[PDB]
Every structure is written in C-alpha cells, then in structure tokens.
C-alpha cells in the first residue's frame, strides 16, 4: 500500500512515491499492478511534469507483467534518458522491440508510397543515430549498412 | 523422489474403517430393552 | 582403503559423462535438448544423495576434491592422457597417505581449472567445476567449520550466477537443471541460520534474467524458491502471483509441477478456498510421482488434506498412513475422528490435547472454520436426510437451545446454498423439501461436451507426444 | 555477420515451410489413394467364389 499516500494532488508527493518506487519496486511488483490506473492518471496529466518518470515506471511494471506494445508506448513516453542507458536487460530488450518496430514500421511505410505514414514519435531515432555512431566509429560498417537493409 | 522440505519428518483392520464409522452408534440390550419400553 | 575405490569409480563415471560427454553434447548439439548427459548427471546427483556423495568420511579424509579438479585443458586429442592422470592418481588413497585438502584448500582448487589454460568456452564445465565439488559439501550441515564453507561455496555459486549471466548459447538447459537443485540448497543453507533478505533480490533478478532469452526450467524452479520463501515467512506478496501470473512452462520435470501445484494449493488454502484448492491438492495427490522415497508423501499429505478435513465430507483417511507416521498422527487420527464426531467438548478437547502439534501445523484457518464445518456437516447430513424437518428437531438435537439462531443457521445455509429449506413462518418450524426429479438427461450432456472435448484434447496431446 | 548470416537464415526456411505444408496435402492425397485401393480390394469379388481346397 504505497499509492493511497497520493491524496496530495500535486506532483510533490508523487515524487515521494517515486522515491519509494526506485527503492522497493521489485519487492512491490505485486503492488503497482493495481496502480496501473493511477500511473495512467500520472501520464495523462501534463501538469505532472515528471510524466517522463511516470512512463519510466510504467514501462518497468509492464516489463514485469509482460506488456510489450504499451511498454513501447511508454518507452517512447519515457523521454531522453531512455535510450542513453547501457543496462543489459531492461533497456536493451525494450529498444530491441522498439527498433524492431522501427524496422517493421519502415517496411510498412516502405510498403506505403509517398507519405501518409505514421510519423516519428518524438523519442525514436536516439540510439539509432547514437549506437549507429558506435557501429560507425567502431570502424566496421556492417551494421551501418544493416540498418539500410532494415529500413528499405 | 522426496526432494522437498518433507525429509525433515485385515482381521479387523479391513473392517476397521467401518468400525470407526461404527464408533458413533451404540457400539454393541437397550435395542432389545426398547421392546419392553412399550 | 578398499571402499574409497567405489567413490573413485563413480566420480570418474560422473565427470566422464558430464565434462567430456556433455561438453561434446554442448559443442554442437541441443536441437531441443540433446544434452542427455545433463539428465544423466542429475540422476547421478540423486545417486550421490542416496549414497554418501564422495568424501564425507569414506574411511579417510579429503581425497578426490584436491585430485580431480586439476588439469582438464580441453586440447589436442591426448587429453585422454589427462584422464589417465585422473585414473592413475588413485594409488594415493590405497597405497600412500591421505591428507586433508578439502573445505579449506578448495579456494584455489576452484581456480585451478581456469589457471591451467584456456580450457574451453562453455559454462556447463564451469558449473561442473563449481557444482560437482561443492554439492558433495552441502549435506553435512553440522554448523561447525562446515556451514560457513557451504556459505562461501555458494558464494562461488553466486559467481556461477555471474558467469551464467555474462557467459558470452542455450547452456541454461544444463546450468538451470543443476541450478534448480543447487539454488534449493542455497535456500536451505541460507535458512538453516536466518531468513534470507537480499537473497530475495538475488532471486528476483535471477528470475528476471531468465525471462525470454533462455526460458527453460529456470522460471518455474526459481518461482518455487520464491513461493516457499513467501510461504516460510509473513504473507504479503501473494498478490504478486495475483497480478503477475506467468507460471506456465512446458512443466518439464514432471514432479516440479506437481509439488508446485501443491505449494500453490497451500497458498489458495491459506488465502481462502475450498473448491479450487482441493482440486489442485487432488491433482498434486494423484500427481504423486511414485512411492520410491520413504515416507515423504506423508507429513506433506497430513498438511495436504487439511482442506478436505475442512470440507467435513471426509471419512477416516487411513489408507495413506505410514506406520512410522502413526506416532506423529496420534493427534491427527483423533482429529479426523473429531471430524466424524459432532461433540463440542471433544471438538475443543482435541485442541486442548494437541494444540502443540496444531502449532506444528501452524494453520489457524482450520480451527477458525472447523466449528462451522461441524455445523455444516450436521446441516448437510440432516438436510439430505429429511424432506420437511423442523428447525427445533435438528436444533435441540445439536444443542442450539433457541429457534432464532437455528433460523440464522438455516438462513446462512440458504445463503451458502445446500438445500431449498424454508421456514413455515409463525415461530420457526421449517417447511421444506429434498430435491429429486431435479434433472437427469440434457444436464449430463452439458458436461459431456467437457468430457469428450477433454478426451480430444488428450487425443491431440498424445498426437503431439507421438511426434517425439 | 549479424546483417548477413543471421538474415540469410530465412533464405531457405520459406521453401522449408512450404514443403512442410505440402507434406500435409500430400498426406491427404495419398490417403485418398489408399482409400481407393481399399475400395478396389474387394468389390468385384466374393460373389462367384469357386471352391477348391488347400493342399
């Protein structure tokens, strides 16, 4: 029971709840699954300026429950500190599914002549052009042309 | 196998389950004395 | 010195298969699991759990673990000469003087198969080198100079978690098969002293890493670990299974799934359930694998059919009774006798006689509803017996002394839905009926869809099993 | 090559799955033929059954 401590309708107790989240979220994996609804309340609220972190622990708990397309939605909603991570489970499986959506999206939009596409959501392209520079400046261009395969 | 925590731990025998089922009914005269009760 | 040749033989028969054979079964094999030496080695681990493992005493001290952990090398095809070294070192135990080089000198012995040479690439040889020495050390928990070394040996097995997580390849169908066993022994040695606290997060992240990339026998076994963790201690995170029910593998080990359903039957027994809990207890009961392990079904069955005792529709349970369980069911036999009897003074005098073994059970859930079970046994019997009974007859036949609590009994029995029985309301005096001519023809063939659809499910399962 | 070898893994699995499919329809066809055979087994016969004796 860590979400009933949120009747203070500012983000300034949502932040103490998140300071509880990033402390004991793996123990309280049972707890947030009911709190999916109020995490949605946090994402919908533009006045909640920590909505980046709302989508962060959203994709965390959906990575726990096995949601993956909504892990993609709130993975894009997570922000700029999303792609930059070097972690070996969470961030690389979800950017695996994300740039898998990028290549299947570029296939479907390569199957879609002259526009009318689904646009670039504002947190794609990050590790595309950032791990792409790892592949480039690691001086083997086979990934650098493998993306050119994958985008058509 | 028992690979769990648990490693911590007809003469009448045939008629015995019924006996404990018979352990609640007049175990073995008041049957016959009921004749003269009326 | 004539008996230690039997560990000398079985030791080489184990790591011949494990090292050379399952390394060749790891090189290019495992289309689904062609590592049949992995199941062979788990058979030999059960064989070392039947026997003494290798060198607990064996009329000497500490012969094999300093010996065979050297010089594997995996090289040019004269490594059978290193096997010849392994074989012809055995004049030391018979002829020479044995010396103590276990449980203290093992700390560089584990680093010997890495510091010889770049031996090979696969982790089941590393899991071998940290399991096949160190599992012969765990079952001697006399807590003096032996359990701190189980502790450090399984810290090397936590380094085996590290070298399971960052090893370059589906070797998890050997290392999770060994790791099921050794992580149970982890939980054993960790909880021979205290409850485990950060080993909970060890287990959490170890469940996390086995999610999709290698989801083979790890998730269900670590979930058994997590379940018995949340079982032995306070009960807060069963809502985690209520929100994250991802508990369905191939159900591979065929007894892991059985005892898994048993443990979660104890869960639903302690949450609240009769029906679903007794049917998964029943499925684990008939899914008892064999009786080839002496009296291990017995205590766990005493705690299994507590819910069937809580049904009230149980007779005496004597067909299960081990005669060595009789001196421990001296409470439990009279308890199921108190289930068959409707006495109240005996219902509390069995408690007053055996509350300590009831604490050995440690389930208050039975006695918090067992009086209610006695009155439901009464209502089931007598309401199945007579069509238009009176509430006074059954009431002052079971000492209720008033009409209105008999009314509340009959009312909460209608609310619990066993029989139609209503009240000829003037001062009570039940007017009621039984129920024959309820229905008998279209209603069986409702369930016959499930009968034969279940049959055709098992048809197709035997088809997909005929595929093997 | 992750952008070649790995990708090349599908260069043949398509025909693989196509033939794995066709084995099913050919099971069907051969079943048809076997039923035809079993039909032709005993349809002209057993009506004028002449009698001799085994020796």
Curated annotation (Swiss-Prot), chain A:
Belongs to the proteasome subunit S1 family. Component of the 26S proteasome, a multiprotein complex involved in the ATP-dependent degradation of ubiquitinated proteins. This complex plays a key role in the maintenance of protein homeostasis by removing misfolded or damaged proteins, which could impair cellular functions, and by removing proteins whose functions are no longer required. Therefore, the proteasome participates in numerous cellular processes, including cell cycle progression, apoptosis, or DNA damage repair. Component of the 19S proteasome regulatory particle complex. The 26S proteasome consists of a 20S core particle (CP) and two 19S regulatory subunits (RP). The regulatory particle is made of a lid composed of 9 subunits, a base containing 6 ATPases and few additional components including PSMD1. Interacts with ADRM1. Interacts with ZFAND1. This is 26S proteasome non-ATPase regulatory subunit 1. It comes from Homo sapiens. The gene is PSMD1.
Swiss-Prot record, chain B:
Expressed in limb bud, craniofacial primordia and skin. One of its GO terms (biological process) is double-strand break repair via homologous recombination. One of its GO terms (cellular component) is nucleoplasm. It comes from the Eukaryota. Keywords: Nucleus, Proteasome. InterPro entries: DSS1_SEM1. It is found in: Nucleus. Signal peptide: none annotated. Component of the 26S proteasome, a multiprotein complex involved in the ATP-dependent degradation of ubiquitinated proteins. This complex plays a key role in the maintenance of protein homeostasis by removing misfolded or damaged proteins, which could impair cellular functions, and by removing proteins whose functions are no longer required. Therefore, the proteasome participates in numerous cellular processes, including cell cycle progression, apoptosis, or DNA damage repair. Component of the 19S proteasome regulatory particle complex. The 26S proteasome consists of a 20S core particle (CP) and two 19S regulatory subunits (RP). The regulatory particle is made of a lid composed of 9 subunits including SEM1, a base containing 6 ATPases and few additional components. Belongs to the TREX-2 complex (transcription and export complex 2), composed of at least ENY2, GANP, PCID2, SEM1, and either centrin CETN2 or CETN3. Component of the homologous recombination repair (HR) complex composed of ERCC5/XPG, BRCA2, PALB2, DSS1 and RAD51. Interacts with the C-terminal of BRCA2.
From Swiss-Prot, chain C:
It comes from the Eukaryota. It holds the Pfam family PCI. There is a cross-link at residue 13 (Glycyl lysine isopeptide (Lys-Gly) (interchain with G-Cter in SUMO1)). One of its GO terms (biological process) is regulation of protein catabolic process. The modification Phosphoserine is found at residues 390, 402. The keyword Ubl conjugation applies. Residues 258-437 form the PCI domain. The keyword DNA damage does not apply. Transmembrane segments: none annotated. SMART domains: PAM, PINT. Residues 1-44 are annotated as: Disordered. Gene3D superfamilies: 1.25.40.570, Tetratricopeptide repeat domain. Keywords: Isopeptide bond, Phosphoprotein, Proteasome, Ubl conjugation. There is a cross-link at residue 13 (Glycyl lysine isopeptide (Lys-Gly) (interchain with G-Cter in SUMO2)). Component of the 19S proteasome regulatory particle complex. The 26S proteasome consists of a 20S core particle (CP) and two 19S regulatory subunits (RP). The regulatory particle is made of a lid composed of 9 subunits including PSMD3, a base containing 6 ATPases and few additional components. Interacts with UBQLN1 (via ubiquitin-like domain). Interacts with ERCC6. PANTHER family: 26S PROTEASOME NON-ATPASE REGULATORY SUBUNIT 3, 26S PROTEASOME NON-ATPASE REGULATORY SUBUNIT 3/COP9 SIGNALOSOME COMPLEX SUBUNIT 3. Belongs to the proteasome subunit S3 family. Component of the 26S proteasome, a multiprotein complex involved in the ATP-dependent degradation of ubiquitinated proteins. This complex plays a key role in the maintenance of protein homeostasis by removing misfolded or damaged proteins, which could impair cellular functions, and by removing proteins whose functions are no longer required. Therefore, the proteasome participates in numerous cellular processes, including cell cycle progression, apoptosis, or DNA damage repair.
Curated annotation (Swiss-Prot), chain D:
The lineage of its organism: Eukaryota, Metazoa, Chordata, Craniata, Vertebrata. Component of the 19S proteasome regulatory particle complex. The 26S proteasome consists of a 20S core particle (CP) and two 19S regulatory subunits (RP). The regulatory particle is made of a lid composed of 9 subunits, a base containing 6 ATPases including PSMC4 and few additional components. Interacts with NR1I3. Interacts with PAAF1. Interacts with TRIM5. Interacts with ZFAND1. Belongs to the AAA ATPase family. It is found in: Cytoplasm; Nucleus. Component of the 26S proteasome, a multiprotein complex involved in the ATP-dependent degradation of ubiquitinated proteins. This complex plays a key role in the maintenance of protein homeostasis by removing misfolded or damaged proteins, which could impair cellular functions, and by removing proteins whose functions are no longer required. Therefore, the proteasome participates in numerous cellular processes, including cell cycle progression, apoptosis, or DNA damage repair. This is 26S proteasome regulatory subunit 6B. The gene is PSMC4.
């Amino acid at each position: 029971g860590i979400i009933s401590l949120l009747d203070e309708d500012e983000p300034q107790l949502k932040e103490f709840a998140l300071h509880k989240l990033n402390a004991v979220v793996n123990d309280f994996w049972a707890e947030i699954s009911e709190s999916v609804d109020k995490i949605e309340v946090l994402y919908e609220d533009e006045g909640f300026r920590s909505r980046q972190f709302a989508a962060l622990v959203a994709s965390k708990v959906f990575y726990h429950l096995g949601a993956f397309e909504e892990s993609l939605n709130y993975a894009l909603g997570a922000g700029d500190l999303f792609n930059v991570n070097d972690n070996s489970e969470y961030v690389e499986t979800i950017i695996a599914k994300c740039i898998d959506h990028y290549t299947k999206q570029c296939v479907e939009n390569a199957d879609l002549p002259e526009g009318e596409k689904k646009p670039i959501d504002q947190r794609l392209e990050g590790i595309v052009n950032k791990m792409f520079q790892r592949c480039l400046d690691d001086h083997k261009y086979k990934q650098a042309i493998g993306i050119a395969l994958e985008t058509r | 196998m028992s690979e769990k925590k648990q490693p911590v731990d007809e003469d009448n025998w045939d008629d015995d389950n019924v006996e404990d089922d018979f352990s609640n009914q007049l175990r073995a005269e008041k049957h016959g004395y009921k004749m003269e009760t009326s | 010195p004539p008996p230690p040749p039997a560990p000398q033989d079985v030791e080489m028969k184990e790591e011949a298969a494990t090292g050379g054979g399952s390394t060749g079964e790891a090189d290019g094999k495992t289309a689904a699991a062609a590592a049949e030496h992995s199941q062979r080695e788990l058979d030999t681990v059960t064989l070392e759990d039947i026997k003494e493992h290798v060198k607990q005493l064996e009329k000497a001290v500490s012969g094999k673990e300093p010996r065979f952990v050297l010089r594997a090398l995996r090289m040019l095809p004269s490594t059978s000469r290193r096997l010849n070294h392994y074989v012809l070192y055995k004049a030391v135990q018979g002829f020479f003087t044995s010396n103590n080089a276990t449980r203290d000198f093992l700390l560089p012995f584990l680093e010997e198969p890495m510091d010889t040479e770049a031996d090979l690439q696969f982790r089941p040889r590393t899991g071998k080198a940290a399991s096949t020495p160190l599992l012969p050390e765990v079952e001697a928990y006399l807590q003096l100079l032996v359990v701190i070394f189980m502790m450090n040996s399984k810290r090397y097995k936590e380094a085996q978690k590290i070298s399971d997580d960052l090893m370059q390849t589906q070797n998890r169908r050997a290392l999770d098969l060994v790791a099921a066993k050794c992580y149970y022994y982890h939980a054993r040695v960790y909880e021979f002293l205290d409850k485990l606290d950060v080993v909970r997060s060890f287990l959490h992240a170890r469940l996390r890493t086995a999610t999709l990339r290698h989801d083979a026998d790890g998730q269900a076994t670590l979930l058994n670990l997590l379940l018995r963790n949340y079982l032995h201690y306070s009960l807060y995170d069963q809502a985690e299974k209520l929100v994250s029910k991802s508990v369905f593998p191939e159900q591979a080990n065929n007894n892991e799934w059985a005892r898994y359903l048993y443990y979660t039957g104890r869960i639903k027994a302690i949450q609240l359930e009769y029906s679903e809990a007794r049917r998964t207890m029943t499925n684990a009961l008939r899914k008892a694998p064999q009786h080839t392990a002496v009296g291990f079904k017995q205590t766990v069955h005493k705690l299994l059919i507590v819910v069937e005792l809580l049904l009230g529709e149980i007779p005496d349970r004597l067909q299960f009774r081990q005669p060595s369980l009789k001196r421990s069911l001296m409470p439990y036999f009279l308890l199921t006798q108190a289930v068959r009897t409707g006495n109240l003074a005996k219902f509390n005098q069995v408690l007053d006689q055996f509350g300590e073994k009831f604490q050995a059970d440690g389930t208050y859930t039975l006695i918090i509803r067992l009086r209610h079970n006695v009155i439901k046994t009464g209502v089931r019997m007598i309401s199945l017996s007579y069509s238009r009974i009176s509430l006074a007859d059954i009431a002052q036949k079971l000492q209720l002394d008033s009409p209105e609590d008999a009314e509340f009994i009959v009312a909460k029995a209608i609310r619990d839905g066993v029989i139609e029985a209503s009240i000829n309301h003037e001062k009570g005096y039940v007017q009621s009926k039984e129920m024959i001519d309820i229905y008998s023809t279209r209603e069986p063939q409702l369930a016959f869809h499930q009968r034969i659809s279940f049959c055709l499910d098992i048809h197709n399962m035997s088809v997909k099993a005929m595929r093997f | 090559d992750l952008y070649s070898r790995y990708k090349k893994l599908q260069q043949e699995l398509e025909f693989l799955e196509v033939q794995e499919e066709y084995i099913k329809d050919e099971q069907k066809n051969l079943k048809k033929e076997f039923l035809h055979a079993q039909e032709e087994v005993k349809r002209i016969q057993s009506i004028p059954l002449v009698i001799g004796q085994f020796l």
